[PDB]
Amino acid sequence: AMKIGVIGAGTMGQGIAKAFAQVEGNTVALCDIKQEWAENGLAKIKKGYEKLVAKGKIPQEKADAIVAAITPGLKENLCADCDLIVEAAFEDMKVKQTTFGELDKICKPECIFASNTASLSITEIGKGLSRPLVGMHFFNPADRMKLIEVIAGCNTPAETVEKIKEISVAIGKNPVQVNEAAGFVVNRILIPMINEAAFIKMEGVSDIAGIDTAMKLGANHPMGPLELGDFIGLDICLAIMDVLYHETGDSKYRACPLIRKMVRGGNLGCKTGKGFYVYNADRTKTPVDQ
Amino acid sequence: MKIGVIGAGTMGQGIAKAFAQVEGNTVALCDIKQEWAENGLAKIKKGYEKLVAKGKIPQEKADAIVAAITPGLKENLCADCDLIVEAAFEDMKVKQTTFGELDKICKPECIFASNTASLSITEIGKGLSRPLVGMHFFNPADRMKLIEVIAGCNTPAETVEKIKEISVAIGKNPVQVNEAAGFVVNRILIPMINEAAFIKMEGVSDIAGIDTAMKLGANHPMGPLELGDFIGLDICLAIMDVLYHETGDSKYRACPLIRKMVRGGNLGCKTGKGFYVYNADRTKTPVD
Amino acid sequence: MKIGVIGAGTMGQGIAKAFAQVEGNTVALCDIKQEWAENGLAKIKKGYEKLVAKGKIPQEKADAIVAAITPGLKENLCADCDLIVEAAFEDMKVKQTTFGELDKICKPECIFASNTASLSITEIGKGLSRPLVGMHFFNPADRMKLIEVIAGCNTPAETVEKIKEISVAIGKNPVQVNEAAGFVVNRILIPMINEAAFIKMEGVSDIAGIDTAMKLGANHPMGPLELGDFIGLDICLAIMDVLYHETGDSKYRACPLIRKMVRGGNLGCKTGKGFYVYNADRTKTPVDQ
Amino acid sequence: MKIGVIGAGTMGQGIAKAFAQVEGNTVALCDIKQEWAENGLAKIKKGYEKLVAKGKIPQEKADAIVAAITPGLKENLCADCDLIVEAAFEDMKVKQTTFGELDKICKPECIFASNTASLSITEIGKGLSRPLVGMHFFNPADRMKLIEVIAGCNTPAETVEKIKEISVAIGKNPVQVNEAAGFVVNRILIPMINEAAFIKMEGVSDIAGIDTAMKLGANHPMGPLELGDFIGLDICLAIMDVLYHETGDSKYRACPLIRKMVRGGNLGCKTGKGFYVYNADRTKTPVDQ
Amino acid sequence: MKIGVIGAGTMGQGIAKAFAQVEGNTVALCDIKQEWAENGLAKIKKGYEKLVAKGKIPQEKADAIVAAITPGLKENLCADCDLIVEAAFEDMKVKQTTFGELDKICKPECIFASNTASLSITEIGKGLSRPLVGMHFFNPADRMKLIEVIAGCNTPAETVEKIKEISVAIGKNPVQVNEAAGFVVNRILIPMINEAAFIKMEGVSDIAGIDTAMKLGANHPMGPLELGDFIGLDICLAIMDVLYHETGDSKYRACPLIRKMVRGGNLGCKTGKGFYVYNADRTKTPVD
Amino acid sequence: AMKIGVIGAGTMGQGIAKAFAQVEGNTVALCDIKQEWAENGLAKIKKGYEKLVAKGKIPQEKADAIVAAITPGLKENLCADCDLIVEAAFEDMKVKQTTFGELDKICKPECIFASNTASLSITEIGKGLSRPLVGMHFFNPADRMKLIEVIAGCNTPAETVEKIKEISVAIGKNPVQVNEAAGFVVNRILIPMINEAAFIKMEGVSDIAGIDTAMKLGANHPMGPLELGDFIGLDICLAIMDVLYHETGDSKYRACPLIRKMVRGGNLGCKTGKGFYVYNADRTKTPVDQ
Numbered sequence A, F: 001a002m003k004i005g006v007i008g009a010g011t012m013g014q015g016i017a018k019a020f021a022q023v024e025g026n027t028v029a030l031c032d033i034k035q036e037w038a039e040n041g042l043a044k045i046k047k048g049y050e051k052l053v054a055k056g057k058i059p060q061e062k063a064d065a066i067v068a069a070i071t072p073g074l075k076e077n078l079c080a081d082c083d084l085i086v087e088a089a090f091e092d093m094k095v096k097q098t099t100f101g102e103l104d105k106i107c108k109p110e111c112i113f114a115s116n117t118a119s120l121s122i123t124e125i126g127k128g129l130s131r132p133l134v135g136m137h138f139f140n141p142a143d144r145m146k147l148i149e150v151i152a153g154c155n156t157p158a159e160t161v162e163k164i165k166e167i168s169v170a171i172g173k174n175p176v177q178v179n180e181a182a183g184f185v186v187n188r189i190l191i192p193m194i195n196e197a198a199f200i201k202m203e204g205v206s207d208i209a210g211i212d213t214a215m216k217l218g219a220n221h222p223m224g225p226l227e228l229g230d231f232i233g234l235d236i237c238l239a240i241m242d243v244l245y246h247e248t249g250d251s252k253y254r255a256c257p258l259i260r261k262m263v264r265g266g267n268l269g270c271k272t273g274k275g276f277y278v279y280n281a282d283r284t285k286t287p288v289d290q
Numbered sequence B, E: 001m002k003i004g005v006i007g008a009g010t011m012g013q014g015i016a017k018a019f020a021q022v023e024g025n026t027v028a029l030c031d032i033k034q035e036w037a038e039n040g041l042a043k044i045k046k047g048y049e050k051l052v053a054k055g056k057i058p059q060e061k062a063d064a065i066v067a068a069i070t071p072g073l074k075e076n077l078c079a080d081c082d083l084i085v086e087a088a089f090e091d092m093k094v095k096q097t098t099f100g101e102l103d104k105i106c107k108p109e110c111i112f113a114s115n116t117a118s119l120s121i122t123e124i125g126k127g128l129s130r131p132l133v134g135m136h137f138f139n140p141a142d143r144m145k146l147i148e149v150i151a152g153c154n155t156p157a158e159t160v161e162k163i164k165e166i167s168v169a170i171g172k173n174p175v176q177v178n179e180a181a182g183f184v185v186n187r188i189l190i191p192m193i194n195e196a197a198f199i200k201m202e203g204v205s206d207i208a209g210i211d212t213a214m215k216l217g218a219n220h221p222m223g224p225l226e227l228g229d230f231i232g233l234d235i236c237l238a239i240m241d242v243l244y245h246e247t248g249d250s251k252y253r254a255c256p257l258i259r260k261m262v263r264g265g266n267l268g269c270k271t272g273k274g275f276y277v278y279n280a281d282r283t284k285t286p287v288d
Numbered sequence C, D: 001m002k003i004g005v006i007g008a009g010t011m012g013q014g015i016a017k018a019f020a021q022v023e024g025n026t027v028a029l030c031d032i033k034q035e036w037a038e039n040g041l042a043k044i045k046k047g048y049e050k051l052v053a054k055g056k057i058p059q060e061k062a063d064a065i066v067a068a069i070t071p072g073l074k075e076n077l078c079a080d081c082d083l084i085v086e087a088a089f090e091d092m093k094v095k096q097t098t099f100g101e102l103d104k105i106c107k108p109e110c111i112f113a114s115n116t117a118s119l120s121i122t123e124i125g126k127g128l129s130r131p132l133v134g135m136h137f138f139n140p141a142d143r144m145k146l147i148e149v150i151a152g153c154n155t156p157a158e159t160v161e162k163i164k165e166i167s168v169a170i171g172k173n174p175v176q177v178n179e180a181a182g183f184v185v186n187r188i189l190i191p192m193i194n195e196a197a198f199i200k201m202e203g204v205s206d207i208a209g210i211d212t213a214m215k216l217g218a219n220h221p222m223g224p225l226e227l228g229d230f231i232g233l234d235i236c237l238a239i240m241d242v243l244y245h246e247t248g249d250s251k252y253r254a255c256p257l258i259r260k261m262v263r264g265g266n267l268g269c270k271t272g273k274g275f276y277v278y279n280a281d282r283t284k285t286p287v288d289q
């Protein structure tokens, strides 16, 4: 028995709502700024489940049971008796401090405040609050990836972190404790990978398909780093690289200019149909270097 | 086709098996001492009997592979070789004189390839009478499917192409690489291990946590700290130092934590202790 | 052909001359203040007078090229031009806004070219209706024979080629260059100037010594410190900053001596004081005396 | 005056010419192998023959300067010289040893000067009995008018001045420079070449484009890639490495494309292949074709 | 001599006392609001009565210092000032327009000086009709003896010399500085505090241990982590960021540990918690 | 009651021997490679004490009592029943591993092995030993500076560190625990100070006397950083800067070229009569920039 409020109905908010709603005994309030926005979020969840049912990867009952646990609305209306708040709204500092400032008055004292941010400081978001703010970082798709990075801020008490650890185990995830630093663990290791592969291509060491083939066969990775950058989104990789660079001040994390040029041109990868690979209707992908 | 493998260590053994695996290939497994070459084939042979007993290879096929491998010295076995793959000790002068001697022994049409990962292909074959190309295998070479074909500064495109064709003939996937420090895999893979150590060093997370996050968050087969322990932390340290000295870029500075562990003999699996202690059972315990 | 030059500074003037000195071209000069745009065609008439007096130009030729330059009001005239060359301030949102207010004013079929020194061609032309290409001139634009032709990711070959033909049609040599911070010349030339300032700041030599060393040792036409003053030290600083921010590499960090000089208005020739003081006798004097 | 040149490569030859082409001087050329030292005076006689045939030199003048260059055996002749100019391999212990074996051979009162490109003047001359001064020539030494005069911490003014007088006495322009890695010209010029290689390696432009850009855009006499081949790419690499190690600043990290070319013997003009291939037709061809 | 001090905060108060301490000087303590200037003098006055009660100053001398200080607005009090020392809010546009207004108010021979530590002296007085020089005091200005005289790009040597003479006239030791980020003291002192935080962050030692080692090993009066807490970690962070952005050199990258503490409001003494917790007694406890 | 063996009779070895011999109940075996070398070491200790007696800063009895506790000789002869070994010989890796390899056979099992190194790895020195190797770092002059940095290597057990902590407190010093990293704590902070001051001078920001005056009055430091570099020895500052740079690979610790040029010229500071200041017979020092 647990009531979970997810603030933000975009991609990540939908996946987090699904992650909690999969576990029996959990109810999710999927909130956003405008009521229609949260309705579109749940409709996008409903539309996604109808596809998995057609492809025979989920029973219709389970999809219906999951959807019936998610209620769209406003945090003023649905988050009073919540036990956990996981915010997953737009990555803007002021918006996050405003959301949690309002939630501090709406929610009961026992409610735990968590944020799914990846680019902003857990410490700075929850500065003026009356209760701890902790990082609960999921990975796309949140309902299937089993990792959760638990982020301890400068003033987050150890009990707050432990509670998030139990909640993660209860929903069938594997919590990993991270003391707040740019990129945490996964992003800090994974995104410089893609960056290095781009440097390799830009410097003419090898070609795109070669670079990806080498990392798949030589390191037994599931995807090549350039394939992965297209899938993750090159605009997101560029932002992570720049955040790592600005937080540390270390030229080690300087972004590859080839990546910066591609983002400027709108070649963001899978979501625009073209990145390091061109994605064609026949489900064929070809490297832009032919 | 007849191949000469120079160096009967672990890598040379794997390369010999990779070529002898394919019907119609003969391999000359050479070293500086005849006994070493015969010991290399003995290690190759006994490894195949464990495979036969495990029922994972016909007894006659294993007998055929071993029969296709001849041990000895390069002066005696490499005159009519079609391809030479060097996999001896990683020293520039050792490799240079080895290929200067092979330059006089081998017939003109014989191709000279090297398995080096850290030394410059271009510098290896600087003053030779024929091109030098890189044919970088991955351990275990008989099982791993990737072959990095390293083009030197003066390697003709025809030599690169023939190595590509040989790679597919033995069932591998060649990827052309213009010579640079760390090639492709090592340039991307080892700084990853280096980054994870930095994360540990700076107190961001714990060893087991770091490794857990990479397999469950990035879908990797092994965590980077386990991987560094498996590769061996002395190898990782040496690769980082090569990348640093070849580029002059502080981006590749090795994590001082790793350098401290290498100095204490904590190299990983090969010594039983790295980021993990490897107990007599099968479990491994992080030194955290 | 009708050409519209956006900007009336040292380079807007030279680009105008570069087109007007070739027969059958007509140029529309533009700036912020009409007074400054009129100061443009004024400083052009002024320089051709000295050249005619020195016998280097026939007065008939000079009067003919000055008759092909018509100072618009920032536009009104920039409406029928077959080619646009902007030479405004090296700031990003400045060039978007300008090209933004320009996609309306000019004719539907008309080529848009930017004379930017190091900025992204792709980002400058984003919301535009037509391609945006880089056409980089070099000070002095009427004399230097090189044109760098830079294409964005979304720049067709028909526009890159048309720029190449227009370049040879006015007696220039176009070299195509892929999009990167500083392209070729500026990426090489400006850190050279930056290095020269570092050498002065660390006291390895004085201003005079550094410039005669590079002139008498590398056969360079101007010392790197004169060339800094000639280009405009504000321009050099802006290019180093773009280099540093685009690559993230401290290799391109601007020399603090130049940043101090730009903060004081010691920009070089265009303010009479940079690394040299420019006296009315037509002589220059190093500020370190 | 009697002058002893230590080294018979491209610069030992040019420094010899620079002194011998001025009346009343006599030069002693030296190298490792007498065959190589004799190859020195041979390649000098060879070049003056082509100049005389081209009418650029009177044969009487050329024969007079070739008569002032006497190839010693690495010394025997370097004993009465009033000035030593070493132009040996740019390695530190190489120059100590050479100047070490030289403090005996030469006369007690005789000036020791090094033509080093970037190495510490102070460290080169440490155990010596006399001061050690830097006298830096520039390829081609008989034509380039600049001489960099570099003093160590323990170098008196009488020696720095005597070098300044000898410089003007042979028609050169001496500029004094404080001791630092690369002095002035090389610190500015070689990273310029290094940058040009980075631009090629990252595919911004091809070899031809880069060199015509700097020639037609900055009025440079040679493109930075030709100049790399002309200087010797081994020399450029050594200078970048000295720069990187002396400052510890990754700003001066040598371009990996140059290090790859030097490892292959593609040194430029002196091996017929660098960034260009040098054909017998007297034409050069970019290796990227 | 008559001095105008612009800004009645802590620094402006100290500079006013430093000049009014010396017999024959009058000071105009100005701000943007008349009440603020009067509150600055009130803080100056009450600080002197605690000194009289402590027996560390004659009652009449303290009465004379306070009497030499007049509060108000610069338009009313600064027309006949001989020297202007600005110590208001550190914003480029604020300081620029302040000196543009003073350019019209003050008599031509009046010298314009600024106490800024992070903003460019050269840029402050860019378009003025008279030179702008830096006169950087150290808190408490009436007690600390060092004065950094900052020469701008266009500051004449005569203006630098007159500030040197004024500094010795009021009993200080002027040190000429050609404008660069961090001048001398801040350029050396703050990266030291930054380094100690890096040492803590990387697990090399503990806070108390770090601070103990610096006073007992280097004979310093305060440990760097205590010093950062005393200076205030927001000030240290801002100085590191200025040094980084002005030089573009990664050598001055601020320690991410400090940036995390500043984000949590743990600024040091001014908030009661930094690297040390400052208890109600007098002891301080490291957050280790 | 404690027997202490000090290996190395140079400057640091003498000061360490004096540090232990000052405390009642301690006996010091001051060893070196050649017997005459250790005799010269004790003679230098004796000669130094005769000067302090003349200047009236120590009683002759105390000097005599301290000297009577120090015995010169060879480690093969004097270190069998030692309770602590503090090596302070020349900073060369192989020499240190050889010394401790030999001492492992000579000394009783209870003997603690310590090294006063500042530039070399505690972990690497004691790699193949049969007992722990720990860092016990003193500061010149060791008999008066109260700080001791206790250096834990990769395999140093916590009890070894604690024993060194007690020994330091027993001899009236203040131990600080340091986990092995280049420069430890003090050198890593202090030497970049001097380096930065040299950069300030080289870049023409201020003059030598100004830089030192500013740090003395502005930061309340006892010595200016350039004064301090001359006193410490510029050759030593250059070596520390280079060790920090090579261990980390971080351009942040790159040595100032002005310092490198001065070391090449023999201007090492106080010990050569000239560094950033010229030291004249009349005890007057003048900055080399006049």
Ligand SMILES: CC(=O)CC(=O)SCCNC(=O)CCNC(=O)[C@H](O)C(C)(C)COP(=O)(O)OP(=O)(O)OC[C@H]1O[C@@H](n2cnc3c(N)ncnc32)[C@H](O)[C@@H]1OP(=O)(O)O
Pocket (backbone or CB within 6 Å): C217, C218, C219, D051, D056, D057, D116, D117, D137, D138, D139, D140, D142, D143, D144, D185, D186, D189, D221, D222, D227, D231, D235
């Ligand atoms: C690395 C370090 O440590 C220091 C260094 O060296 S850094 C590099 C320094 N050197 C440079 O930078 C060189 C840069 N490049 C240049 O300056 C120019 O490209 C260049 C001067 C070499 C151009 O070559 P050039 O002008 O054709 O040679 P130059 O001799 O000046 O002129 C050609 C003429 O030689 C003339 N000539 C007359 N007398 C001559 C003589 N005694 N010797 C040689 N040439 C003579 C001829 O007239 C010929 O011209 P024509 O064929 O048209 O009649």
Ligand SMILES: CC(=O)CC(=O)SCCNC(=O)CCNC(=O)[C@H](O)C(C)(C)COP(=O)(O)OP(=O)(O)OC[C@H]1O[C@@H](n2cnc3c(N)ncnc32)[C@H](O)[C@@H]1OP(=O)(O)O
Pocket (backbone or CB within 6 Å): C051, C056, C057, C116, C117, C137, C138, C139, C140, C142, C143, C144, C185, C186, C189, C221, C222, C227, C231, C235, D217, D218, D219
């Ligand atoms: C920052 C960016 O984005 C890109 C950039 O701009 S980077 C910088 C690029 N620009 C450069 O590098 C310039 C470098 N410097 C140089 O090339 C040379 O110093 C220089 C060409 C400017 C030298 O000046 P110069 O040679 O005296 O001017 P130049 O016109 O070529 O020759 C002088 C002659 O003008 C001649 N002349 C004849 N017709 C002329 C005409 N229509 N216009 C101008 N000059 C004419 C005259 O004959 C005069 O010579 P005399 O007085 O002896 O008779």
Ligand SMILES: NC(=O)c1ccc[n+]([C@@H]2O[C@H](COP(=O)([O-])OP(=O)(O)OC[C@H]3O[C@@H](n4cnc5c(N)ncnc54)[C@H](O)[C@@H]3O)[C@@H](O)[C@H]2O)c1
Pocket (backbone or CB within 6 Å): C006, C007, C008, C009, C010, C011, C012, C030, C031, C032, C036, C086, C087, C088, C089, C090, C091, C094, C098, C115, C116, C117, C118, C137, C138, C139, C230, C231, C232, C235, C270
């Ligand atoms: N040596 C050089 O000057 C160098 C050479 C080639 C190209 N670059 C680039 O050319 C462009 C201009 O160079 P410059 O020498 O004329 O600089 P400049 O300092 O002389 O002034 C630029 C001119 O453009 C005007 N301007 C600014 N914003 C404008 C706008 N929005 N619309 C119209 N006019 C505007 C300015 O008032 C000024 O007249 C820059 O992008 C520069 O990076 C200049």
Ligand SMILES: NC(=O)c1ccc[n+]([C@@H]2O[C@H](COP(=O)([O-])OP(=O)(O)OC[C@H]3O[C@@H](n4cnc5c(N)ncnc54)[C@H](O)[C@@H]3O)[C@@H](O)[C@H]2O)c1
Pocket (backbone or CB within 6 Å): D006, D007, D008, D009, D010, D011, D012, D030, D031, D032, D036, D086, D087, D088, D089, D090, D091, D094, D098, D115, D116, D117, D118, D137, D138, D139, D230, D231, D232, D235, D270
């Ligand atoms: N473009 C240039 O070549 C450039 C220009 C000016 C100065 N620099 C410096 O001049 C010196 C030589 O330049 P280079 O062009 O002749 O190089 P190079 O490659 O042409 O050969 C140098 C010559 O000196 C010989 N040599 C090497 N060691 C010697 C020794 N111990 N004693 C006598 N001879 C020895 C070599 O055999 C060779 O003949 C170097 O220090 C270089 O840094 C060269």
